[PDB]
Structure formats: C-alpha cells, structure tokens
Design an enzyme around this catalytic site. Structure first.
Site, PDB file in Angstrom:
ATOM      1  N   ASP A 245       0.827  -1.201   0.000  1.00  0.00           N
ATOM      2  CA  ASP A 245       0.000   0.000   0.000  1.00  0.00           C
ATOM      3  C   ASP A 245       0.864   1.255   0.000  1.00  0.00           C
ATOM      4  OD1 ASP A 245      -2.752   1.254   0.310  1.00  0.00           O
ATOM      5  OD2 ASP A 245      -1.785   2.041   2.122  1.00  0.00           O
ATOM      6  N   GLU A 276       2.056   0.002  -4.842  1.00  0.00           N
ATOM      7  CA  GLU A 276       1.255   1.154  -5.214  1.00  0.00           C
ATOM      8  C   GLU A 276       2.104   2.408  -5.016  1.00  0.00           C
ATOM      9  OE1 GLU A 276      -1.708   2.551  -2.571  1.00  0.00           O
ATOM     10  OE2 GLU A 276      -2.100   4.224  -3.947  1.00  0.00           O
ATOM     11  N   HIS A 369     -10.349  -0.732  -5.999  1.00  0.00           N
ATOM     12  CA  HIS A 369     -11.050  -0.278  -4.803  1.00  0.00           C
ATOM     13  C   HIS A 369     -10.976   1.242  -4.621  1.00  0.00           C
ATOM     14  CE1 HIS A 369      -6.993  -0.436  -3.015  1.00  0.00           C
ATOM     15  NE2 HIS A 369      -7.469   0.464  -2.175  1.00  0.00           N
ATOM     16  N   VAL A 372     -12.997   3.276  -7.511  1.00  0.00           N
ATOM     17  CA  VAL A 372     -14.437   3.159  -7.303  1.00  0.00           C
ATOM     18  C   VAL A 372     -14.797   3.761  -5.940  1.00  0.00           C
ATOM     19  CG1 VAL A 372     -16.458   1.627  -7.376  1.00  0.00           C
ATOM     20  CG2 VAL A 372     -14.474   1.073  -8.758  1.00  0.00           C
TER      21      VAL A 372
END
Length: 550
Positions: A245, A276, A369, A372
């Site tokens: 993350d 990410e 995720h 959206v």
C-alpha cells in the site's frame, strides 16, 4: 518440547508483565534495547494473553497473530507450523490479477466465500487473486486499511485457519494469492504501539494517520517489525507475493531504503512484490545496479486516469491532469503520462521517464477499490460510460503490455457501487470520518451505516455478453503473447486509435469515423457484430466499437 518464548519491544515502559488469562501474571526480563522476554513451559494453542504496563493498564500483543474479540480484545496463540514452498509457481509475465474485498466479495463475507468462487475465477483466466488487507481492523466492516495488527488475520473474515485454507485451496487450483499489506500507516483505533515505544515517526505523517519510524532514533527495531511481518506471511501462510500500500507514503533517509530491504526479503523467498506508487519514479521498480529498490512492479494510475478521463469527460480532482486521447497513447507507449512534466493538480513537475523497462514492471486497471470507492457515490465505471465504451476500456488495458488487474465484479458487468465503509466504535473517530468522507469525497451514504457496506456487496447478477467478452479477452492476451512487450505501434485520429503489436492489431473506435487501416488480419474478438471476419489494408468507415485481429 512445548514451551514457547514471548517477546515484546517496549522501551518506554519500565517493567511489563505477561498475563495469560486463565493462568497467572508473569514478570518479564528486560535488556538494553528495550525488549521484554520470558520463556514459559505451560503455554498451549490456544491460550489468551495480554501485556500489563507500568500504567497497570492491559494491552493486546502488538505483534499478535489472532485477535478473537477484535482490536481491544485479548491476543490468542495460534498453531505455528512453517510449511511453505521455497518458490512460487507464479511467473510474473503470466500475471492476471483479480482484486478482492473478502467482506463484500460474497454473501458469506468470509475466506470460505472466496474459496467457493475459486473455480469461477480459474475458469475466467485469472492467474492470481489480490486480497485486500486482512490485518485485524476495528469491527467487521472495513476495506482493510484501518488495520492495526499486522500479524493478525481478521477474525470476522475467518481468522488464520480461514486464510491459510484459502491459499491452500488456491494453490490446489493453480491460482496464486497476493496479499495487500500496509507499512505506511496504522489504524486510528485499537493501536497500542504509541504507549510502548517510538514505533511512529516524529518527523512527518500520512493523510490516514501516524507513519512508521524507519530512519530516526530507535528505528532499527521498527524496521525489524515490518521486515519480519513480510517474512511471517510467506513462512506461515505460504503467500505468493505482496501488494504494498502507498509506498510513496513510506519515507526513509537511511543508506538502504526500507523498500529495498522489503524486496530483498520477498526475493530471498522467491516471491513477488507489487507497489502502489504515486511517485511516477522508476526507482521503485528499477534494478539495484540501476539504483532502484527492485520491486517487481508498480501500479500506474496514469493509465486508468487516461482511459477514465477520456471516456467519462470527468475532470474533478486528479482527472484535471488528464482528458485527451493523446494521454492514452502516451501512457500506452511511455507508461507514465507524467514523466517529468508540470501537473496542475499537484502544482509541480511530476515524474521521471521509465526508459527501457518492459511492460511487466507495471500493473494497469480500469477499476480498483480506490478508483471506485473514493468516488462519493462509489459508482463503478460501468455507470459512467455506455456499453460500447466499457468494452473498449476493458480491451485497452487487458490487451496492454502491462500487467492487468481486474476489480472484483468488473468482469461480469457488476452495477452495484463500492462505497467507503468503516466500523469504528470510538465516537470521535466515527464523527471525524463521516465529515471527512463528506467533505473530501462528497459521500452522502454514512460510512458507519451497515447498509452502506451491504450495498457494496457484489450482486453476482451475470451479464453474459460482457462476461464472455472478458473471458475471450484474457484468452487472446495469453495466446497473442501481449504480456510485457512494449514494442507496439500506435496511430491515432481524432476519435479512434489503432494499436499494433507483434502478433495482433486492435481497433479502438470511440465515434463513427473513417479509418485508414494498414494491416491484414483475421477477427479474434469484437464488441460488435459490425466488424469483418477478414480485413485488409484499406479505408473503412467504422461505427463506435472495438475489434481485435490476428
């Protein structure tokens, strides 16, 4: 024998005791660094325990492996049998990722639920599933990013036994599992590390809470905490790899960056790391002899943003940096759109070119995720474009040189929103997140309302035209050898574009227009029935749609 050793790093604390619930209180021995340790002969899976401070207050093991009664409840002993293959069977050049939120993926909302859906996934063509964070978080309704026990598998997802059985059954079907892990911040509730020692950085912090201490006083031990966590997931759960993350939110001024070390750990055990990154900086992904941390791949928002902005016409937030067809072609042949040019969104020069790195150092997506859930009304892209565009979008990324990642449900045309939800019990955090989501994202649904979570569960209402489309798209990708190969040739007119690889060429027609085609081919797949079975070099007038040719 059966005796086991307890270790708790707590430099701030003068003297701490072990508290095994049914048994007694046991005094722990301290060392120079601030570690408290005892070996106990009488412990068994699965006794419950806590630690009691100078404070006399009782906290759960921060390095706990199971939290049966949530974040504020006691810690429990698990069976620790280190069974793992030294290698993953996953070839990263074969990687098709499927992002899953365990809580909402199935009616079940548990690991068993995803297990049941394994055959479906396998059949689709996916080679690995990415599980959103499972580190114990408050309550039972959370994306996973408010996780606060890095070693403890979420109780309401099905616990350790549950997650383990998931990876076991995944491998059994020939599927891989990638775990989303958070090393940049920690959840706002049920975090007790702050009372123990300098786990968190004095210097700066992240938008989502307190950031880890990697480069300052006493940071050795907190580095050990994270590096051993990645070792733990591999050895005790046999996980194939990791999605890290927000690596941009991990700052480290040390001679060797923690991200380089994290990778070293996963590569020692022949696994895979995806990052990410928001940095648009090839260093995250570059080889060591070229100065990178050698992370296997990174998310490239630029791709998604290019496609999204263009098809939606949306320009709010970061979409303001994108919008034109050129951006899509740019991202398709340069990876980053922002490779060292000025961003109006960030108000600065952003990024760096990517050089000759092949496509398989980057993952792309039209849905996930974030893209959206961070929308106030949580709308999936299917609600923002027509059936044609949606198909064109799926084609664009699944047929790209980069690693594609499907968002759970995207592939059958799922229409349900994916909202942001949380399950905090501290009323100040509840209050802050409501107004936070209200102001930042324009969310009108209450994140702490159960209905918001429920509405986010996939419907499983299969649109077979779309589902068949994805399935064939995946199949052709494999068959055409599209993976990693950045040697593509892209031509673009005002409302259309053609991308030509080694073995294929694709038509992306966003409006009716007359197109000059310079290639011969046999039709493999089409969003319409409007395209020829065989085509030849010539001028044609195509209606909006997509077509793939051999």
């Amino acid at each position: 024998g059966n005796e086991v050793i307890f270790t708790l790093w707590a430099p701030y604390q003068k003297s701490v005791k072990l508290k095994v619930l049914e048994k007694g209180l046991y005094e722990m021995e301290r060392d120079e660094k601030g570690y408290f340790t005892i070996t106990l002969n009488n412990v068994k899976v699965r006794d419950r325990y806590k630690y009691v401070l100078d404070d006399a207050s009782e906290i759960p093991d921060p390095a706990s492996r199971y939290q049966p009664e949530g974040v504020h409840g006691p810690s429990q002993i698990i069976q620790e049998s280190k069974e793992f293959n030294n290698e993953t069977f996953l070839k990263k050049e074969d990687l098709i990722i499927y992002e899953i939120h365990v809580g909402t993926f199935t009616p079940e909302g548990t690991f068993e639920g995803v297990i049941r859906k394994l055959d479906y996934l396998k059949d689709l063509g996916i080679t690995a599933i990415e599980i959103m964070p499972i580190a114990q978080f408050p309550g039972k309704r959370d994306w996973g990013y408010d996780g606060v026990y890095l070693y403890a598998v979420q109780n309401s997802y099905g616990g350790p036994e549950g997650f383990r059985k998931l990876v076991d059954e995944a491998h059994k079907k020939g599927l891989g599992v990638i775990l989303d892990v958070v090393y940049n911040h920690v959840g706002p509730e049920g975090n007790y590390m702050v009372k123990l020692g300098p786990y968190f950085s004095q210097k700066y912090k992240t938008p989502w809470g307190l950031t880890f201490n990697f480069d300052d006083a006493e940071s050795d031990e907190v580095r050990k905490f994270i590096l051993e966590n990645v070792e733990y997931w591999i050895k005790e759960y046999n996980v194939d790899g990791f999605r890290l993350d927000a690596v941009h939110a991990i700052i480290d001024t040390s001679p060797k960056h923690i991200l380089e070390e994290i990778a070293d750990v996963v590569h020692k055990y022949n696994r895979i790391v995806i990052a990410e990154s928001d940095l648009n900086d090839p260093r995250v992904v570059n080889p060591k002899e070229k100065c990178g941390y050698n992370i296997d791949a990174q998310w490239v928002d630029d791709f998604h943003h290019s496609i999204h902005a263009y098809l939606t016409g949306e320009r709010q937030g970061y979409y303001t940096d994108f919008g034109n067809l050129d951006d899509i072609v740019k991202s398709y042949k340069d990876v980053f759109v922002y490779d060292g040019k000025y961003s109006n969104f960030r108000r600065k020069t952003h990024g760096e070119p990517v050089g000759e790195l092949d496509g398989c150092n980057f993952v792309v997506y039209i849905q996930n995720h974030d893209q959206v859930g961070n929308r106030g009304k949580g709308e999936r892209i299917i609600k923002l474009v027509d059936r044609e565009s949606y198909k064109i979008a799926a084609a664009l990324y699944l047929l790209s040189p980069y690693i594609p990642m499907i968002f759970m449900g995207e592939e059958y045309g799922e229409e349900n929103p994916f909202y942001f939800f949380s399950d905090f019990s501290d009323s100040k955090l509840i209050q802050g997140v409501r107004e936070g989501r209200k102001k930042e994202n324009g969310q009108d649904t209450d994140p702490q309302d159960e209905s918001t979570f429920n509405a986010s569960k996939l419907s499983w209402k299969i649109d077979e035209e779309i589902f068949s489309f994805y399935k064939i798209l995946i199949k052709m990708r494999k068959e055409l050898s599209i993976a990693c190969d950045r040697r593509v040739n892209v031509v673009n007119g005002e409302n259309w574009l053609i991308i030509k690889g080694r073995e294929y060429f694709s038509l992306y027609v966003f409006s009716k227009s007359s197109i000059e085609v310079k290639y011969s081919g046999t039709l493999l797949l089409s969003s319409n029935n409007s395209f020829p079975q065989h085509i030849e070099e010539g001028k044609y007038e195509f209606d909006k749609g997509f077509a793939l040719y051999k």
